Write a protein that binds this ligand. Structure first.
Ligand SMILES: [Fe+3]
Ligand SMILES: [Mg+2]
Ligand SMILES: [Mg+2]
Lengths: 212, 197
C-alpha cells in the first residue's frame, strides 16, 4: 500500500529529535503506553484473532492525516482497537462509551490482499536480483524506494515466514518463504541525491526476480 | 480542511480498549502487567552490550555471532518476541552500519530494548536511509569520509544488532568494563563506543 507510512526517502523533515547517548527517559512515558503492545499480544497469542502482520497493516490503514498527527503508541491503540472491531470482538459503540468520547478507527481495507506467489526463485548469496515492478494496494513489506531496483543478495534466511501480503489480510494462503538481505548501492535508490553507501532491505522471495 | 478528527484523550481510549477486552474475559489475570514488566526490566540494551563485549574478548564467539546470530543470542537465553531471527552486522575500518525500520519501528527488542521515541520518529524513518551521514552528524557522530555507511532497513523478520568496532584504550578491559561503553545507540548504529580519559 503506497501510504504515507512509506516514509523512507521523503524530503522536508527536520532534525531527528535526539543526540547520541542522551537520556531517553523511561521505557513508557505514560501509564497507558504498555497497553498497545500487550493487547496486540493478547490478540495474537491468546485470542488468535489476528497476526502481527494485520497490526502493521491496520496502522497503515489509518486515514493519512490522522496517521501523520498521531504519536507512535497511540497509532497502535487505534490499530488494535480497529482489528478488535473488524473481527467482531468489540464494537465501536462500546469503545466510545467506555472512552467517554470519540474513538475514530483506521479506515476499511481497499484490498483483499494477495496470495503467496506460486512462481518464485531460490536465490544465492552474491546473485543479482531486481525488486519486482508491481503495485500492491494492500499490505506489502517492500518500501517503494526499492521497487524495480537492482541489488545483490547478502543473505538468504534459514527460516521461512508467511507472505505479508496474504497474512496481513488474515488470508489462508500466505504459505511460507524465506527473505533475502538485498544490498543496493545508494545511487541505485536515490541517484546523486544521497550521502550514503548502501542500503540493505530484507525482502520476501516473492518480491524478487532475477536481474535481467 | 485537513483538521484532526475529534478524539477522547488517548489515556481514556487506551484504557477503554483494555476494559472492553478485560470485561469479556479475554485478557488473562496479570497479563498486561506481566508484559509491562518484561518490556521494562527484561528487554534491555544491557543484553546486546553483553553480547558485544563477549564478541570483543572471544574470537570464537565473535565468529558465531556474525555467522549465526540467533544461535549466539540463544546461548545467553536472549531470544524473544521481535528477536527470534538475529543478524549481527560488523563495523570495520571502512564500514559503519546503522539500523532503521522505515515502515514502522521494528527493532530487536530483547537485546536492544524497545525502540526509543526518536528511532520511531518520522524524521529518522524518512531521512536515515537517504542521508545517513548527515543524520549521524546532526546526532553527534561524525563518520570519517573513508567509511561506507550501510543502512539496514528492518522490513521483514530479521532483527539486527550492530557489532561496533572496539575503541583503542580498552585493551585488557574486563567484559563488565566493555559492556558499560556499549550503549543502546551503539547497538542501533548511530553512536560509536566512547572511552573516557
Ligand atoms: Fe517497524
Ligand atoms: Mg510512496
Ligand atoms: Mg584488540
Amino acid at each position: 500500500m503506497d501510504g504515507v507510512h512509506d516514509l523512507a526517502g521523503v524530503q522536508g523533515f527536520g532534525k531527528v529529535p535526539h543526540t547520541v547517548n542522551a537520556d531517553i527517559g523511561p521505557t513508557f512515558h505514560a501509564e497507558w503506553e504498555h497497553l498497545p503492545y500487550s493487547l496486540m499480544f493478547a490478540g495474537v497469542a491468546e485470542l488468535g484473532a489476528f497476526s502481527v502482520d494485520e497490526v502493521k497493516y491496520v496502522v497503515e490503514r489509518m486515514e493519512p492525516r490522522h496517521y501523520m498527527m498521531t504519536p507512535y503508541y497511540e497509532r497502535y491503540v487505534i490499530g488494535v482497537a480497529t482489528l478488535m472491531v473488524e473481527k467482531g470482538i468489540l464494537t465501536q459503540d462500546e469503545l466510545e462509551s467506555l472512552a467517554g468520547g470519540p474513538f475514530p478507527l483506521s479506515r476499511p481495507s481497499e484490498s483483499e490482499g494477495r496470495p503467496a506467489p506460486v512462481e518464485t526463485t531460490t536465490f544465492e548469496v552474491g546473485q543479482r536480483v531486481r525488486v519486482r515492478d508491481e503495485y500492491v494496494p494492500g499490505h506489502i513489506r517492500m518500501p517503494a524506494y526499492c521497487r524495480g531496483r537492482v541489488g545483490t543478495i547478502s543473505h538468504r534466511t534459514t527460516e521461512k515466514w508467511p507472505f505479508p501480503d496474504a497474512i496481513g489480510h488474515g488470508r489462508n494462503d500466505a504459505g511460507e518463504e524465506p527473505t533475502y538481505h538485498v544490498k543496493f548501492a545508494a545511487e541505485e535508490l536515490f541517484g546523486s541525491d544521497t550521502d550514503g553507501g548502501s542500503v540493505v532491505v530484507d525482502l520476501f522471495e516473492g518480491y524478487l526476480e532475477p536481474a535481467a | 480542511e485537513n483538521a484532526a478528527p475529534a478524539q477522547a484523550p488517548v489515556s481514556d481510549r487506551a484504557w477503554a480498549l483494555f476494559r472492553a477486552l478485560d470485561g469479556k474475559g479475554l485478557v488473562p489475570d496479570g497479563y498486561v502487567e506481566g508484559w509491562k514488566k518484561t518490556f521494562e526490566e527484561d528487554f534491555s540494551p544491557r543484553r546486546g552490550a553483553e553480547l558485544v563485549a563477549r564478541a570483543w574478548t572471544d574470537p570464537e564467539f565473535r565468529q558465531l555471532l556474525l555467522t549465526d546470530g540467533t544461535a549466539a543470542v540463544a546461548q545467553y537465553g536472549y531470544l524473544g518476541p521481535q528477536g527470534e531471527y538475529i543478524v549481527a552486522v560488523e563495523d570495520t575500518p571502512t564500514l559503519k552500519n546503522v539500523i532503521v525500520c522505515s515502515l514502522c519501528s521494528c527493532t530487536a527488542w530483547p537485546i536492544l530494548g524497545l525502540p526509543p521515541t526518536w528511532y520511531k520518529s518520522f524524521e529518522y524513518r524518512a531521512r536515515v536511509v537517504r542521508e545517513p551521514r548527515k543524520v549521524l552528524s546532526e546526532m553527534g557522530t561524525e563518520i570519517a569520509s573513508d567509511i561506507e555507511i550501510r543502512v539496514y532497513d528492518t522490513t521483514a523478520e530479521t532483527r539486527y544488532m550492530v557489532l561496533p568496532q572496539r575503541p583503542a584504550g580498552t585493551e585488557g578491559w574486563s567484559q563488565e568494563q566493555l559492556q558499560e561503553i556499549v550503549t543502546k545507540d551503539c547497538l542501533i548504529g548511530v553512536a560509536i563506543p566512547q572511552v573516557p580519559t
